[PDB]
UniProtKB/Swiss-Prot annotation:
Keyword match Metal-binding: yes
Originating species: Homo sapiens
Regulation: Activated by X-ray, histamine, L-adrenaline, L- and D-phenylalanine, L- and D-histidine, L-His-OMe and beta-Ala-His (carnosine).
Outcome reported for the amino acid change (mutating H90Y): In OPTB3; partial loss of activity
Cofactor note: Zinc. Can also use cobalt(II) with lower efficiency, but not copper(II), nickel(II) and manganese(II).
Ranges of residues in domain Alpha-carbonic anhydrase: 1-255
Name of the protein this chain belongs to: Carbonic anhydrase 2
Length: 255
């Protein structure tokens, strides 16, 4: 499975038939169709005491992993019931600045999309969480190209180190709070992972307001490799999945 002409999103249904399920992600967020729900509580993000551990190129993206043995960095409130622990974050980028985001707003596509993955701790482990309709919580943030984001440089600088598939590097004392927008206004809907195994275990929380990163910042992402070290070089670009059918589902607005 990949993002190529032969193993891309259009072919995932063969190995993963849930690809054609009832609550697949991402979707298109119609701002006029979304429902302002007044019963929506504010998001509660506690990442003050977060412990970053490493960064790894898994062949489809780079993940920054966090120590989730304890309630260090948790997400609660909003549409959620209980606490979700951050386990990792990754991005989806395009080849150009006019594509990249997974989720669209009125069909508008961003240069990248940041996903912070959280798992419901009543289930005890990530493994068990991905077996529940309410197992995971994904915090989605759109990235636009403009001004440089000071808080993202640490990552940008380490990518030289995990060029190919399989490489990993120590990556401690990274504060995720640096990746957040000013506003916590969001959209929420029941969805899935946007990569195989496309499990329908996620409560998606997409923030209204984007963070801006510089062109030189996003450019470093495009220098990455899908391929493993010592194989034909395949640039890690367009590692996103097209929007899917909402199919009955309703998208709620916190604003
Ligand atoms: Hg599930
Ligand atoms: Zn993702």
């Amino acid at each position: 499975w990949g993002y190529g002409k032969h193993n891309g999103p259009e072919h995932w249904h063969k190995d993963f038939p849930i690809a054609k399920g009832e609550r697949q992600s991402p979707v298109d967020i119609d701002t006029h169709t979304a429902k302002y729900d007044p019963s929506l509580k504010p998001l509660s993000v506690s990442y003050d005491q977060a412990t970053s551990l490493r960064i790894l190129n898994n062949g489809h993206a780079f993940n920054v992993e966090f120590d989730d043995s304890q309630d260090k960095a948790v997400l609660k409130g909003g549409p959620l019931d209980g606490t979700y622990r951050l386990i990792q974050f990754h991005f989806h980028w395009g080849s150009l600045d006019g594509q990249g985001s997974e989720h669209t707003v009125d069909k508008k596509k961003y240069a990248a999309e940041l996903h912070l993955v959280h798992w419901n701790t009543k289930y005890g482990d990530f493994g068990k969480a991905v077996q529940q309709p309410d197992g995971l919580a994904h915090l989605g943030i759109f990235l636009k190209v403009g001004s440089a984001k000071p808080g993202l440089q640490k990552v940008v600088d380490v990518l030289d180190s995990i060029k190919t598939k399989g490489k990993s590097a120590d990556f401690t004392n990274f504060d995720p709070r640096g990746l957040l927008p000013e506003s916590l206004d969001y959209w929420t809907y029941p969805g899935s992972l946007t990569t195989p195994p496309l499990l329908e275990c996620v409560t998606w929380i997409v923030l209204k307001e984007p963070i801006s990163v510089s062109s030189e910042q996003v450019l470093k992402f495009r220098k990455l490799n899908f391929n493993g070290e010592g194989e034909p070089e395949e640039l890690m670009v367009d590692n996103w999945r097209p929007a899917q059918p909402l199919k009955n589902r309703q998208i709620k607005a916190s604003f």
